[PDB]
Write a new protein. Structure first.
Lengths: 90, 97, 107, 7, 571, 96, 96
């Protein structure tokens, strides 16, 4: 029910499985051989933390009645996070 | 509702909790995956231990400052919370060079 | 070192300029090297990064001059029966000490 | 012209 | 004489010619130099090389600190907006995104960005981009709400006085009241805690919001309250802002003795400080011409909108709402001035221009687009009468029918059924139905027009009388109900001379109508009884016609500040 | 009569006083306690202005005076695009 | 009127002279600046010998090729220890 989300620098970011199913790549990583750890040797930890912060942001705010606040993506992290968003297909 | 991450050394617990909940039930959430006894585990926000008697709202973890996009942080110990990484320092452009 | 904008601490420049501006107003002796040096310090404050310290420079000078004339005012009011000699002695120093300081603050 | 200036 | 160019103006033209290589290093230059490089790019017409830098907020923060050359920035900014690139909406969004990120910071960084917002939002609001300035202020407002001490409460009321100003140029009145109510929440909190805030600029905006919604009874109440808080320590920009709005509420109050001293002091106060080229000076002239048009001083009202337009046509580029607003009022003033002559070709060009601009920059359902749409329709119906081609007469008069109804709907949607502006369209549509030979339909429009104005304004008012004369001409010239028209002409006669005397130039259509009134019901003795009064009107109008232009009427230093306020307050 | 402008690196640029008084800063630099002249040649020690641009300023000084209110069309000042920036920063500092 | 850039070591004197003016009086202008005798100074114009007489017309440059927009350099050197030293002019600076 928890997914071991390690980073390039050996940093784990475990989160609920239903939250980690927002990204289509992680859903594909869970499928096949191997709710366990998945190799993330390319994506670094400082940008994967923001992905995990987005995961709880996406699921909680689905069909929200109120206006959803902007997800903060810092300027120093924006370019690296964008490739992570495409690679994860989040 | 209060969203938090729990960091002992590098494990991170992105699990929500009610603003009126106490620390005791959140400690049971940590042992769900870390499979460690809850009495040994102790938490340290801003290097300060949190009492199990007080609820989440009494520790400053207000739901208005615990948004899912930027959840508040809290430590954990059985502190050695290492930083994730250093993002590449982008130039300020307008600085002289 | 180029004359492009750069970050500069106001206190070090203002203290290095307060001694020159104190001697310029009172028609004291400031060497040619320092007076031409003090023009760059005026420039480096009006184009300082990130905030142009042109308002702080003009406020501190305004406070400094307001300090100076009321200092001269205390040295004249006490000297009764010779105010006219003391005023003009302190006026020709300040009348030339304003146009000279006007040139220093030209930027 | 009979209705004066239009308002 | 062939004077050589300064080394500055030569090095400027040498770094602009090498801009591609030196674009990185130009952004590090001082503010005075950096703006002169960018203005040279506009002079060379290389707007693409320029709008690529103004879209960044940090560069537009540096070129906004050049207060001496702000009049060149407005023309350089407006050129970008007409060029294509939405440099106003990009800056406003890029500020809101950057402002939303420093919410979790100290009071030093937050105050740095709030001051950027007050000069950026103070520039977009100045250039006319009210829909894009509000997004800047709404981000500046939510920075002041995070900290709830006495220091930041004075900025939240500083945003709300500006938010109330960008929500009136955008004609979002129904949000304006909620903004004012939110301001008082941040005013009572600050005022109670041992720090009284100057409630003078803020009440001046309500003098224009409630003026806009035709709440002239409520406008004058806040007109007095605004000027009671005028203090010599206030900025001249704030002080001249209260005076012009106070004049507009006093003129529509139909009291003109107190109105002239407020706006003639405003024009003088906006000419000695801002000068004859700053947009604020032309803004005061636009409200000054409002005073001239309602006091029947129509002869020099055109010359004061043309001055107001020519200032805005030089500072605010081609397609700007402020230019369009001047085009609207100049078209209306030229309409009123040349109504008797019947030649509307300069007036039509101005009215068409004010629509070619507003439709480009505003949505199709904007209130300010409606008021600028009625002026063309008024001009079209007069051309549809003066022209002798029956095919042109019918089609152009039908085009003016779609414009009033479109204009009426936008006013009726926001101002409600019971307002002067809604009734003003009823009277204009009533006059149009008279020209459309729909005399049965023209009856019920004027009746609804007068009944709404009489209920709101009162039994005796200048606007009511001018509407009655529209109905009086209907009952007299083409409906032959002389008994009904007899009381209507007399009703406007008393009100017309009540605030203007017998020399009111609008009485020409009132006295002459009385002559035709008595021509078809006998009683030819009274025909000569009104015939000499028409000559009396001729004598009492041309003799007072010879007067100096209003531009030099204010002259130099006519009165003093904190004296016109006291003179007006006691009366 | 002659004014000895000194660059950052020590390069002297001795030029006539009349030519070097078209510069607002140099006019202000000589005016005041800058008149304590060595002989009749006042020196100016520019701490920030480098030598490679100070020649172009001086070469502008003779360019301004000679072509002042001239009858003929004035040739454009030859400014290298590689130094068009360091000269631009030194064209408002010197007010020339 | 030809504009020149008489320079040695660090000094970069800026003067002017007529097209047909003599080279000797050009040394006289420099004579009244650094108080050196006219025969003491030697004009090593473009690393070639220049006699104390001659004239600027046949010196090697005209007014058009040494315009005030970009005047042409002229070397200079003095005689020390009963022998004339070679020119030692160096480039101004390296512009970044």
């Amino acid at each position: 029910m928890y997914v071991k989300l390690i980073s390039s620098d050996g940093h784990e970011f475990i989160v609920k499985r239903e939250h980690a199913l927002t990204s289509g790549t992680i859903k594909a990583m869970l499928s096949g051989p191997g709710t366990n750890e998945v190799n993330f040797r390319e994506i670094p930890s400082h940008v994967l933390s923001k992905v995990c912060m987005y995961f709880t942001y996406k699921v909680r705010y689905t069909n929200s009645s109120t206006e959803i606040p902007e997800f903060p993506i810092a300027p120093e992290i924006a370019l690296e996070l964008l490739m992570a968003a495409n690679f994860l297909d989040c | 509702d209060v969203f938090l991450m729990i960091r002992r050394h590098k494990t991170t617990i992105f699990t929500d909790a009610k603003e009126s909940s106490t620390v005791f039930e959140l400690k049971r959430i940590v042992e769900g995956i870390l499979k460690r006894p809850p009495d040994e585990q102790r938490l340290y926000k801003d290097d300060q231990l949190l009492d199990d008697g007080k609820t989440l709202g009494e520790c400053g973890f207000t739901s208005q400052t615990a948004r899912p996009q930027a959840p508040a942080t809290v430590g954990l110990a059985f502190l050695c919370i290492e930083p994730f990484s250093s993002p590449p320092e982008l130039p300020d452009v307008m600085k002289p060079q | 070192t180029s004359l492009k904008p750069r970050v500069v601490d106001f206190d070090e420049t203002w203290n290095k300029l307060l001694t020159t501006i104190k001697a310029v107003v009172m028609l004291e002796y400031v060497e040619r090297a320092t007076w031409n040096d003090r023009f760059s310090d005026i420039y480096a404050l009006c184009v300082a990064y990130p905030e142009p310290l042109g308002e702080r420079l003009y406020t501190e000078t305004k406070i400094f001059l307001e300090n100076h004339v009321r200092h001269l005012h205390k040295r004249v009011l006490e000297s009764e029966e010779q105010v006219l000699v003391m005023y003009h002695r302190y006026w020709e120093e300040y009348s030339k000490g304003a146009d000279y300081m006007d040139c220093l603050y030209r930027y | 012209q009979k209705r004066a200036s239009g308002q | 004489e062939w004077i050589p160019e300064t080394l500055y103006n030569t090095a400027i033209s040498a770094v602009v010619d090498n801009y591609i290589r030196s674009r990185r290093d130009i952004r590090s230059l001082p503010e005075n130099i950096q703006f002169d490089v960018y203005y040279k790019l506009y002079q060379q017409g290389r707007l693409c090389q320029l709008g690529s830098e103004f879209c960044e907020l940090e560069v537009f923060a540096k070129v906004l600190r050049a207060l001496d050359k702000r009049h060149l920035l407005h023309h350089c900014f407006q050129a970008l907006m007409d060029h294509g690139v939405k440099v106003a909406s990009v800056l406003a969004y890029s500020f809101s995104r950057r402002c939303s990120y420093i919410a979790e910071s100290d009071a030093a960084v937050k105050e740095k960005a709030i001051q950027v917002g007050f000069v950026l939002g103070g520039f977009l609001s100045d250039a006319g981009w009210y829909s894009d300035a509000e997004k800047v202020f709404l981000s500046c407002l939510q920075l002041c709400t995070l900290h709830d001490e006495m220091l930041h409460w004075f900025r939240a009321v500083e945003c709300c006085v500006r938010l109330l100003h960008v929500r009136n140029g955008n004609c979002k009145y129904h949000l304006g009241e909620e903004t004012f109510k939110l301001a008082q929440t941040y005013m009572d909190k600050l005022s109670k805690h041992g720090q009284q805030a100057n409630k003078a600029a803020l009440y001046g905006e309500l003098c224009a919001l409630l003026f806009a919604k035709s709440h002239y009874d409520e406008a004058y109440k806040w007109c007095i309250e605004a000027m009671k808080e005028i203090t010599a320590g206030l900025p001249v920009k704030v002080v001249v802002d209260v005076l012009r709005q106070a004049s507009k509420a006093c003129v529509v109050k139909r009291e003109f003795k107190k109105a002239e001293q407020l706006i003639k002091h405003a024009v003088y106060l906006a000419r000695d400080h801002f000068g004859s080229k700053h947009p604020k000076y032309s803004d005061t002239l636009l409200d000054y011409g409002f005073y001239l048009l309602n006091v029947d001083n129509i002869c020099q009202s055109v010359a004061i909108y043309q001055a107001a337009l020519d200032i805005r046509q030089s500072v605010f580029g081609g397609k700007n709402i402020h230019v369009a607003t001047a085009h609207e009022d100049l078209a209306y003033s030229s309409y009123v001035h040349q109504y008797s002559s019947g030649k509307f070709d300069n007036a039509l060009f101005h009215a068409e221009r004010a629509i070619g601009i507003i439709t480009h920059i505003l949505p199709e359902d904007h209130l300010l687009l409606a008021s600028s749409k009625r002026v063309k329709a008024l001009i079209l119906e007069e051309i549809a009468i003066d022209c002798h081609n029956k095919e042109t007469e019918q089609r152009l008069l039908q085009e003016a029918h779609d414009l009033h109804l479109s204009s009426l709907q936008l006013a009726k949607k926001a101002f409600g059924e019971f307002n002067v502006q809604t009734a003003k369209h009823y009277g204009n549509l009533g006059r149009l139905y008279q020209s459309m030979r729909k005399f049965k339909e023209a009856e019920e429009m004027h009746i609804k027009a007068i009944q709404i104005k009489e209920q709101l304004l009162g039994q005796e008012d200048y606007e009511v009388a001018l509407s009655v004369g529209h109905l009086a001409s209907l009952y007299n010239y083409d409906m032959n109900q002389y008994e009904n028209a007899e009381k209507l002409y007399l009703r406007s006669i008393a009100i017309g001379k009540k605030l203007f005397g017998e020399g009111y130039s609008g009485l020409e259509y009132d006295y002459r109508g009385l002559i035709k009134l008595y021509n078809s019901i006998g009683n030819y003795e009274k025909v000569f009884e009104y015939h000499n009064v028409l000559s009396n009107w001729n004598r009492l109008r041309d003799r007072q016609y010879s007067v100096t232009d209003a531009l030099e009427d204010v002259s130099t230093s006519p009165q003093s500040t904190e004296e016109v306020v006291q003179s007006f307050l006691i009366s």
